[PDB]
Design a protein around this ligand. Sequence first.
Ligand code: H46
Ligand code: FMN
Length: 437
Amino acid sequence: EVQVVLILAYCSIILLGVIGNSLVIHVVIKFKSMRTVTNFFIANLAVADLLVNTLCLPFTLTYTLMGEWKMGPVLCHLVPYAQGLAVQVSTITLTVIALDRYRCIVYHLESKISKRISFLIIGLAWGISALLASPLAIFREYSLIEIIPDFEIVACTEKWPGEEKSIYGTVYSLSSLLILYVLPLGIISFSYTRIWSKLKNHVAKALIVYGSTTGNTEYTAETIARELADAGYEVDSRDAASVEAGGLFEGFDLVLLGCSTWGDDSIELQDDFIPLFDSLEETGAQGRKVACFGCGDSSWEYFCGAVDAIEEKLKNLGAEIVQDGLRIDGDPRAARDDIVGWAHDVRGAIDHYHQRRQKTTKMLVCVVVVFAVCWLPLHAFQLAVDIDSQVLDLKEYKLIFTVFHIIAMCSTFANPLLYGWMNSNYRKAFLSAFRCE
Ligand SMILES: CCN(CC)C(=O)[C@H](c1ccccc1)N1CCN(c2ccc(NC(=O)c3ccccc3-c3cccnc3)cc2F)CC1
Ligand SMILES: Cc1cc2nc3c(=O)[nH]c(=O)nc-3n(C[C@H](O)[C@H](O)[C@H](O)COP(=O)(O)O)c2cc1C
């Protein structure tokens, strides 16, 4: 029985996709751990596929099983619009995800796009796509057709301006297939192809900038630097005395800033570091992974105060602090163990940002591949049987377009499963919501 095999094919999508896509909206909101720019697009994808599992797929089912459109004529226009609207916001949202990642990976940053521009791009996407899919809403027609003398039956189909003029309906079905399926899958493919080699054959680059008056922080910096070199980093030591602040951090995966503490009844930085601190906003620090060390003397009121001062400025500038600062007491040669320890801890933290990157990059690639393969049938169809215009095999054809349409609807419910399976901070977040309910 074909009607029942499509009964549960369409609703398990509805159910797998409402619960699935409701968890993604929820956890990105309830957990500040999860509020990132990438997850806001991921929740935007989720909100696009929720609009399809609850609005479209429910009324689609009943128009397929019964065969008669039993809802209003307003919905006959709106459900095809709400369906086209979703695939465009999805395609725009995935294309933004791929480019943003590519940009963070060349600038060696943890954010390029701000959390407040990301809301503005999410707006344009719904705005630009609500305009691009309005032909889907206007060129629908509500009227009667009787297959045989069944006394009530009404269908819902597309009607393009001419009585036999097919051209408006194909260029739309060719430009949109072009500008919104092979163009954005072209861009996405290009980005992840570059990103992938990048992530595979990169060497980490470290900048060490210290300020040192009698050589203690300088000795500490040489000691850090010998462990990061032994760890496969390409290390770059610069005395603060010899640099200028503009663009100083650009290109580096890791910046360590070392400074000794000075001053009289107040904290002062080491003297060569003052100009770098006064100009720290021109260095490229937002999104940059940093850490801080310094030499001090626990006799003083604020032991290694300069570290705190720098850590707070870097934090104000929106930099991503990666360890708590290292504060050496006395002669750093007598503290070599504490220093080499610290350096090993910084290295491990960088390995986790790098690993978190690879893991999330490969989940994002699975999402697009499961998107493009699932839309491949329907669009193959759409391209073929919109240059042909001869398909009266509708005992097969209508089934061909539905079973093709069911595949594409799997791109809705699939996304929460990939997150839970292939991303451990999602896995834990879903199970941390099903544990407070
Ligand atoms: C499934 C039930 N059935 C019959 C089996 C439907 O027809 C169901 C429907 C349900 C209830 C009432 C009326 C219609 N219809 C199912 C198809 N759909 C629809 C319409 C448009 C899009 N955008 C694209 O594909 C698309 C995506 C990216 C790039 C280009 C295109 C593109 C668009 C237009 C022409 N070229 C290419 C997707 C859609 F899914 C609207 C409702
Ligand atoms: C005048 C003066 C003020 C100092 N103030 C502090 C301080 O406030 N907090 C602190 O932890 N160490 C303080 N120190 C100790 C120095 O930070 C320490 O001697 C350090 O080793 C100098 O580092 P450097 O040789 O790399 O420049 C002060 C030292 C001097 C001479």
